Amino acid sequence: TKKDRVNHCLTICENIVAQSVRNSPEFQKLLGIAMELFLLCSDDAESDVRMVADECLNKVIKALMDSNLPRLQLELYKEIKKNGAPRSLRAALWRFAELAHLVRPQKCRPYLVNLLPCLTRTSKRPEESVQETLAAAVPKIMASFGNFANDNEIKVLLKAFIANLKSSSPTIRRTAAGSAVSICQHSRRTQYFYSWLLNVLLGLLVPVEDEHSTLLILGVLLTLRYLVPLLQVSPSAEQLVQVYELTLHHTQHQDHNVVTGALELLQQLFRTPPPELLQTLTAVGGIGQLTARIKGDIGQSTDDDSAPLVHCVRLLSASFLLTGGKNVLVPDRDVRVSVKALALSCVGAAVALHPESFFSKLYKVPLDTTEYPEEQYVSDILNYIDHGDPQVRGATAILCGTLICSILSRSR
């Protein structure tokens, strides 16, 4: 009956729209029963059956978004609480984020309380396909159901997703990170909930000379690429400078999945910087007032008589893409050319902030004139125009663009 199952689902659809009679005590009973039956047609495993009868459920909704919206959204909340099959629960979750901004604010507050028991179970599910669509609904649901919750309901929901940063799947790590940050745009207080996510994560990396379970090191740095775009009681000016020393230790912590995680976080905090953090780095003393492969004295980000952005260009160069003795390329065998690509785009976004870093010497205390004849400056960054692939000769194409943009605007 595999061809007999196809004809059954499609004839139920057309005889609802062609009724032209809604809000009737006969019409109310008919729409509840055969609405759950549209998804068993998708639950049955055949691509001739799964593709055909899922486009037919969308014919019902859109012809009824005017007439029967409160009857549509009551049958649909029932299936998530049923917590069904990972194919059945998935394609119902597309339907419920697009009708979230169609509810009325009269009936909205009953719909908020019932979802938080239902939105934690689908966070505990290890199916890698079920976890994906929730990172495309927690953007859409909690922006229209955002304002209707108090400070009690939203503190429970964010302790669950951080326990979904403790899993080892790359598909499940990036769906729990975009869920914590879409709530705080819409929670109740947009600025109060930005300062609260920064306290929870830095105790997961409280003092850095520990064993930090290097899968869990990657969970904390992906929630911070989504929230620095939103940082522009408040998040304090001493709360944001604890974020910044945490990464320079983690551009050195060896891996190829943990070195690439803290280098997308640094390219974005210079492009859209938080304005409290942005004045503490251009300043001359810098971090010294807030406290009161490399083989030389760089001078750490606590020292005075130099800005910290003078410090931060000496550090990302002699570890990744430069050797302190001579103008010479580093081999692609040592550092990957996916890892050398994100290190040329971080030296360029700081020159737009502090342009005096690019003219500095690489080592502060010079390095061993017996071994090496001459000491070099950071201008061998601009010898990576001849290096091989795109996005290195193209990301030293963009390193000369914002070095000229920001000397003219620095000295007038």
Cα dihedral 108, 120, 191, 277, rounded to 10, equals -160
Supply the DSSP symbol for 361: B
CB-neighbour burial class of residue 261 (10 A; exposed 0-12, middle 13-18, buried 19+): buried
Query: Is 182 in contact with 141 (CB distance < 8 Å)?
Result: no
Tokens found for residue 280: 């503490």
Sign of CA dihedral 26, 28, 33, 38: positive
CA 356, CA 208: separation in Å to the nearest integer?
A: 30
DSSP three-state, residue 377: strand
Tokens found for residue 87: 């194919």
Cα-based angle 407, 309, 250 (whole degrees, multiple of 5): 140
CA 49, CA 45: separation in Å to the nearest integer?
A: 7
Packing angle, helices 241-248 and 275-282, rounded to 10:
60
Query: 353-384 b/e with 16+ CB inside 10 Å = b?
Result: bbbebbebebbbeebeeeeeeebbebebbeeb
Segment (H or E) for 142: helix 141-144
Tokens found for residue 6: 């196809």
Q: Residue 349: which residues within 8 A CB-CB, separation 6 or more?
A: 267, 270, 271, 402
φ, ψ of residue 246 to 5 degrees: the values are -75, -25
CA 234, CA 276: separation in Å to the nearest integer?
A: 10
Cα dihedral 278, 282, 285, 286, rounded to 10, equals 20
Q: Which residue has the tokens 């495309």?
A: 136
Q: Which residue has the tokens 């659809």?
A: 13
Query: Is 160 in contact with 179 (CB distance < 8 Å)?
Result: no
Q: Residue 106: which residues within 8 A CB-CB, separation 6 or more?
A: none
Q: How was this structure determined?
A: cryo-EM
Distance of CA 355 to the CA centre of its chain: 29
CA 221, CA 245: separation in Å to the nearest integer?
A: 13
Breaks after residues in the chain, judged by C–N over 2.5 Å: 232, 292
Residue type at 39 in one-letter notation: L
- Strand pairing partners for 361? 377
Segment (H or E) for 178: helix 177-183
Query: 164-200 b/e with 16+ CB inside 10 Å = b?
Result: bbebeeeebbbbbbbbbbbbbbbbeeeeebbbbbbee
Tokens found for residue 145: 């159901």
CA 180, CA 135: separation in Å to the nearest integer?
A: 10
Kindly report each contact of residues 9-17 with a partner whose C-beta sits within 8 Å and lies 24 or more positions away, as own/partner: 9/37, 9/38, 9/41, 9/52, 9/53, 9/56, 10/52, 10/53, 10/56, 12/37, 12/38, 13/38, 13/56, 13/57, 13/59, 13/60, 16/60, 16/64, 17/59, 17/60, 17/63, 17/64
Query: Is 324 in contact with 296 (CB distance < 8 Å)?
Result: yes
Query: Is 219 in contact with 262 (CB distance < 8 Å)?
Result: no
CA 38, CA 335: separation in Å to the nearest integer?
A: 53
The reported resolution of this PDB entry, expressed in Å, is 10.1
DSSP string, 25-79: TTHHHHHHHTTTHHHHHHHSS-HHHHTTTTSSTHHHHHTSTTT-HHHHHHHHHHH
- How many residues appear in the chain? 412
Q: Residue 332: which residues within 8 A CB-CB, separation 6 or more?
A: 340, 388
- Strand pairing partners for 377? 361
Tokens found for residue 157: 């929901």
